[PDB]
Structure formats: structure tokens, C-alpha cells
Assembly symmetry: D2
Homo-oligomer: 254 residues x 4
């Protein structure tokens, strides 16, 4: 069921399948508030910024195609990726997030993302959590620390951290049901066929192993990024957790 480059009759060499995928992930998330007017400039036409709430995350993801549920056995690097993002709370009519800036370390997740309107670049991303068998720290508990960082082209993009203060629950995260995407494929020559459309993307959502705590975030700057759009912020809360979901193709809105 491979649907992209490299196209061959077998489909073995395609980056992404036309198939349902499943994800499990561990996440470090920091909620922020920026000037809503600055964030609106980053939103595609038809989405309205909320009160400036933003989420920064660094996560470690494990995805599986329903078309090849055992692919991890022979191709482990095709089954895991890391990702960092700065996402903006917004509305279409319906509450959601628009993930304006996303960096991932596997291009199959980049392209799958782009096809469903997720703006992604390639970066280097690390999520560090205390391993539960680590005898010096144990795992997640009060006093545990979690860290994340992402970088691209030699530039630090942002750093995130959490000092865990207590076990948490769904109250400690700002869930908004929709994820809005901008499926965009521009023309570099006037004869090329462009695509530009708003889409909405997840079923079977489970969230758990939630810990809340004292967050920190430090934004970097790069000549080919626009990180300053998130610079003048209020840091609201931090949480770390695990989550699983299924996604298909994102549905065209307009």
C-alpha cells in the first residue's frame, strides 16, 4: 500500500503507506502564553488564534502501519522517531491546535506529516526521562527531572524541562479535540500544479502515566527559523505523559 516516492509496483520502497497508522509516545510538554496577535500571523487563513496559549513539546514516538504491523522486526529505524514542536491553540468555526513549527528526525514522519498538513523540518531531537530501573534516580516520581532539546543546522532551537512535583491526571493538560493542518505543496514553476488546503486530522486516544511539575523553556534563534514569534511568553505549566492514538488521512476542510 505504499503511496509515495519511491513508487514501484510492489510499493516496498514508498516512504508512506495509504493505510491507518498507530502511535505510542512519551511526551514532555510545556504550556505557554504569547501575544495572540503574533501567533495569528503564523496561522493559515481560516484559523483563529485563541488567547495565546501555545504548547511546546518534545516527544519520543513509535508508529506502526496497519499494512505492516511487524515491520519493526526487520526495520527498527522505520518504527521510531523523535519530534519537537511549537503549536498554537486556535479555532475553525471547533477547538484545536495548529502545529506551526515541527522538527522530526525521520523523513518518513516528515512526509507523512506534510501530506496531512503538518509543517515539519528535520532536526536532531532528544527526550531524556529517568529510566525506571536506574538505581540512582528511579523513574518518574516527585523530584524527578525530564529534559528535551532540539537543534537544526548547528543552531539550538529550544530546550524544555520539567521537575516533577506530583502525579497528575487529564486536568494537567490542555486537550483541544482538533488538530488542524495546512496541506501545502507549492509551485516552483508557474506550470506546476500547486496544493493548498486546510485539513483536520485521531481515534482510539489513550493518555496516561501523567506527571506534573515545574517547567522550564529556553528558546534559541536561527537564521532560517522564526523562533522569536514565541519569545515573549508566559510559562504556564509543565507535564510529562504517555499517549497512544490512530490516524488515517486528514479530511479536507476548505
Amino acid at each position: 500500500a505504499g503511496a509515495t516516492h519511491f513508487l514501484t509496483p510492489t510499493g516496498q520502497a514508498s516512504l508512506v503507506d495509504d493505510a491507518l497508522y498507530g502511535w505510542g509516545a512519551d511526551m514532555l510538554t510545556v504550556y505557554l502564553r504569547c501575544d495572540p496577535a503574533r501567533l495569528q500571523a503564523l496561522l493559515p487563513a481560516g484559523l483563529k488564534v485563541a488567547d495565546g496559549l501555545c504548547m511546546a513539546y518534545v516527544g519520543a514516538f513509535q508508529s506502526t502501519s496497519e499494512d505492516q504491523p511487524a515491520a519493526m522486526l526487520r526495520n527498527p529505524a522505520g518504527a521510531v522517531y523523535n519530534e519537537a514542536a511549537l503549536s498554537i491553540a486556535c479555532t475553525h468555526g471547533r477547538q484545536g491546535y495548529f502545529p506551526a513549527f515541527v522538527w522530526v528526525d525521520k523523513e518518513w514522519s516528515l512526509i507523512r506529516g506534510w501530506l496531512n498538513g503538518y509543517p515539519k523540518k528535520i532536526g536532531a531531537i532528544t527526550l531524556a526521562r529517568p529510566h525506571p530501573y536506574n538505581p540512582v534516580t528511579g523513574g518518574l516520581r516527585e523530584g524527578a527531572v525530564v529534559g528535551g532539546i532540539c537543534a537544526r543546522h548547528g543552531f539550538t532551537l529550544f530546550r524544555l524541562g520539567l521537575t516533577v512535583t506530583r502525579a497528575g491526571d487529564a486536568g494537567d493538560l490542555r486537550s483541544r479535540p482538533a488538530t488542524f493542518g495546512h496541506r501545502h505543496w507549492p509551485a516552483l514553476h508557474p506550470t506546476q500544479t500547486p496544493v493548498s488546503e486546510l485539513v483536520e486530522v485521531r481515534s482510539d486516544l489513550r493518555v496516561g502515566d501523567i506527571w506534573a511539575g515545574e517547567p522550564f523553556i529556553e528558546l534559541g534563534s536561527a537564521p532560517d527559523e522564526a523562533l522569536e514569534c514565541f519569545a515573549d511568553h508566559e510559562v504556564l505549566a509543565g507535564v510529562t505523559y504517555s499517549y497512544g492514538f490512530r490516524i488515517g488521512g486528514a479530511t479536507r476542510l476548505e
Copy 2:
């Protein structure tokens, strides 16, 4: 004038003319034309099975930011390996670069936008540095090497033992580069794109050409189709430098 994500008033790619300079290691091969045809998009017809494998070190610059290299050096260089198929569109002769791996996603996306099928890999081109006092630079007896890998799998290895200075007779030049600009729908409501394009590069210059004894060794990966190039005859090897300018690829027809 960034034209892609991230769109802000941070784009990977500019709507602008780009220039490249590059050093290249190239091995020409012949495979079964019938196997290669299966890799060609509709409307391109395989030639006699001629294929080219290359590993190159590229330096690209946008005319919109000709000095970007000063502040963003990693945005100005990339490495790339490819397996390309000699083919025709009508009577016009070209190459279709069926499998390409590059190590910078701005080159991946620029490639995809102009119909180059690219993945991200790790690619190294090693050529003798002219100031190296043990070897000197390129000359008779010099060796050149290239390798590319993805997901931990070796994709292919290339090499050359230089035998003599060369000239354009040693490059199997075909004027067109044909692409498949492809953007599929993952939901039936999404708008797909599938169109054949032709890249014309202006200002092409080739030089510092050396010919020699080639070698190639194909790997295998569960998410690649390297076997399509496996049963081959190794024809020739060359290393050289080349520069050109490219704009967008012109649309030829829908698929």
C-alpha cells in the same frame, strides 16, 4: 521569498533561481531495460538499460540570498547519492533519477517539488585533497570513494581508481532531466498531484574530469528496491566537477 513550510510573513525552499557547484563520482551501468521500465513513470520510455550511479558533494545557493552561507553554512551544502535511468520522453533524451538519497531536507523538498524522488540518508564522498602530501590530488593512480546508507542499511558503495585525465567523451550526457512531481492523497477528499516535469538547467559547466576503473556494490534494505539495479554490467567510471543553475521544473503532462 520563502515558498514552503514554515510559512511566515523560515521556509525550507525559495521561489527563486538556485545555483550549484558540485564534485561528483559517477559509475555508468547497464541493467535489463525491462526491469528499469517498471520504475519509470508513465510517459517515459527506457533506453537500452543505461543507468548512472553517483555520489556527490553539492554546494547550492539561492539568488534570493547569495550570501546566506556566511551565517548559515549547513544550509548551503549537502551530499547526495542516486541511481538514475536513461530514458526518453518522445524523442528527447534524458535521465529519470528514480532513487535519490540526500542528507539535507531542504534539498529533499526542493527535489520533490521539482519531481526528484528523494529520501534522507547518510552520504559520504571522499576524494583526495590536493594538498595531501601522501597522495596529492586527482591524478593517475588516485582513488575516489562514495557510500550511502539509510536506517542502518548500506544502500550502495561506489569507487574509482583514476587512470587518466578525461573529457566530455567520458560523461554520458543526456540533455533532459525528467521528474515525477508527485503529491498523493492520504484521504479521498485531499487534492492529489501527479505530473511529469522536465528540469532544464542553465549555465551548465563541467570540468576537472578524470576517468578510471569503477566499482559499485549494491546493498539491500527492507524499505528499498535496490535489487532493481542488481543484475548489471559495469561500464565506466568518472569523477568530475560541475556547476549549473535551475529554476522550477516545467510541467510536461499529467499522469
Copy 3:
């Protein structure tokens, strides 16, 4: 304790502090020709019956001295590692000699070398099913686990497991000692070399969440490696598990 040496000590790759590790592991046990493996052992170690261990792991290390360093330096707190290790003995004492090891963080490379663990830098991935993944679930009967490592563009080896059952410490082949060859050669005759056999024992050890299954291994080859030393093997067993440990400096046994 190492470069870069400064008055603060903040730029040292490796320090004297005690560390703890947690890890998830994929391990395949093998049997090779004992005579071939003996050629890889430093003087004073005797091969066992040819038993070997291949592993791929995702590791997380923390200093007792800086237990919260992970908050500001996450990439300094995690690494992946792959190894081919040889079961052997020093006298009647049973251990492993980890002949070939590849890691993706040089602070782990250097700590290894200082204790006689031979390490190179490679690219290493361990993939296990995430428990929240709704397509697969986590570790269970029928789950698959994969690992791969590569260097210089060459696949070094691939490992995998199809889980068949829950497991126990019985499915691991414990030999307490890790023998090392602490080696620092002279590149000029006036330089001071080091060559000595050392022994590490874990001062804290935990294994759990053990799953056994059907293994596979596929060795590659590279011009600057000696993977063929492990090539003609019998595949014995496979296991995936979680692991925790504490290690200090390795005690010198004898000069070489």
C-alpha cells in the same frame, strides 16, 4: 577527570563520580568456534564453550553527584549501544569480554575505554513496541523487537526477536565479571603506554520485564571491522528485558 580539563571540572567528558544506568535490552545468545573467539581475547582470558552475546540497548545514565543533570542536558543522559561479547574465564572466574562495542555518545565511549571496554562510535537503534500503540500494544506474545547498528555507512549487524512467552532471570546467561583490556598505546616511542587486564563487577544489578522469543541475527561486514570472527555461529536464544546497574572503576588484574 578527563579532557577537557578546567578548574571548574564542568567540561570533562568523564568524571570520578558514581553512575547509575537504566536500560532496555535486546539480546541474542550465540555459539561460535571457540578458537576463533580466543584470538580476540587478551592474554589471561580463556574462551568458554564459544558462547557469545549480541545485544542492542537503549541506555540512560545518571551521576550520583549530578542527579538532575538530565533537566538541562538531556543528550548527556542517554545513549544507545550494540555489542558482540565473548564468554570467557580468568582462572575459575566467569565473565564476558565485550570485544566489539559501538555506542553513539563519546562520553560513553571514553568511560568504556578507561575501564578497558573497546568502543567505537556508530549509529544504533533499538525499537520496541510502545505499550500505548493501539495497533500492536506493548511487549506480549507475538510482539516483535528490532535492533540495528551501523558505522561508516556499513551495516554492522541486525538483531530481532519475535516474543513467544514471558521470561525470567533463567533466560539470561549471567556471568558476573566484565573483563576489560585497558589499553592506551604509544604512537611515539617516548610516549607512556598502558596495557593491563581489568575486571568490573556490578555493585547494583537489576533485571526484569523479561520476554523470551524467536531470535534472529544478521552480521554485516566492513573493511575496518572484524565481524567475520562471529559469522559461523549457532543461534541459541533471544530475550528482551529491562536492566539497571551501577559500576565503578575496573580493578587491575595484571599487565599485558
Copy 4:
């Protein structure tokens, strides 16, 4: 030769053969407070007037007795490197001590350490205009050159040059010696440590294709680095050039 030690020796990271290098270099000269730089120097080296050099380079090395290794192992034949080095003296002998070095191939890290060059692994890019690029041309008046290095996600430093004129050896601040601290500490009191000052001299040296221009440097910061030691500087000059050299092992001068 080093790990991995095998009878063949095909798996050693480093051999004691003579090597030759060719390289393209971006260099910025600086002056810092000599008192801060002295704190980074090992005992027996005296800081000069505070002159430091920052460089980013693309290197290509070849073993004199494996001169064709690049054909089959290209990644073993090239590396990138960034450094901050301190002008100093040993007696009245003038040299550089390369206090902080980041390289992207561990065989270059280890060869460095053996010869007393303190090296870590980083990601390093040197970008120079390719002569065949029709938008820019190559090196000329008005050309721009850039270099950057990073580790653990932290930018370490950035360098750049806007070329103003062709240059010559007058534009280099050549000091014949490179002084090293060959250091191999003990992690257990029974282990044999090494700590000695060494001197490397080039037995073949070439510099050419020199261009001078307007430099820039921007130091970063990291929790596991000490880049602030170079922070309060005066930017003196910038140059890009090509370089070739042969080096063997560094000679031991004295213990530390």
C-alpha cells in the same frame, strides 16, 4: 594500534603509520585575557599575549601504508573539526595548545587523544563557495565562508569570513609547535594513569590559496563545556586557506 585489537589489525581505529592530511580551513584570530587562558593550559606551558585561534576545517587524511583505503572506506578518510587553540610557549618554543576541539569521526578523536589533543565529538560544518557555482563563483573578493559546530544540541561557536583580498603567509599566525596533554586518567586507584606534555612537529607542511577578510565569531554556551573562557575577546583577523601536513606521533616532553 588501538582497539579493536585483532591479529589482522584490520579493526583498529588508529595505527602507528605516518599520515598525511589535506584540509580547507576557516580561521579567526582572537585575543582574550591571558589570565583566563592560562587556567586552561597544562602545567609547563605559558600563555602568550592572549592570542587564540578559532578554526573550522574540512580534513582528509590518508595512511602512508594504506594509501588507497579511501576507495573502499570513504567515511574513514574525511572528517570535520572545530577548535579553540591558545598561543603559548614551552621554554622559548612557540606553539599552540588546542584546548577545546570537536571532531565528527572518533578515529580522529582517538588519534588526537593519543597525541594529547583534547577532542570531543560534535557536528561540524564548513561551507565555502564552490568554484563552479554560477551564482557566487568560488573564493574571490566579496566571497563568504561559514563554519559552525554543535554538540548535544548546543551551538558551540559560529565563524564566518567576508573575503576582502587575496592573502599570503603574512595573514597566518604560525607557531611551529603544537603542544598536547597526553592524558589517560585512572578510574580505579589500581589502574595505571598517564599525564604528560607532548610536542607535535610537522614533517611536511603546506599552506596556500589564502584569502583574508572581515571575520565574525559567535561563541555559544553549554552546561558541559567551558566556552565562556574565550568569551571576552578582541577579534583580530580572519582567513580561509588550504593546508597540507604530515605528522607522526607527538614526542614526550615531560610528565605533569
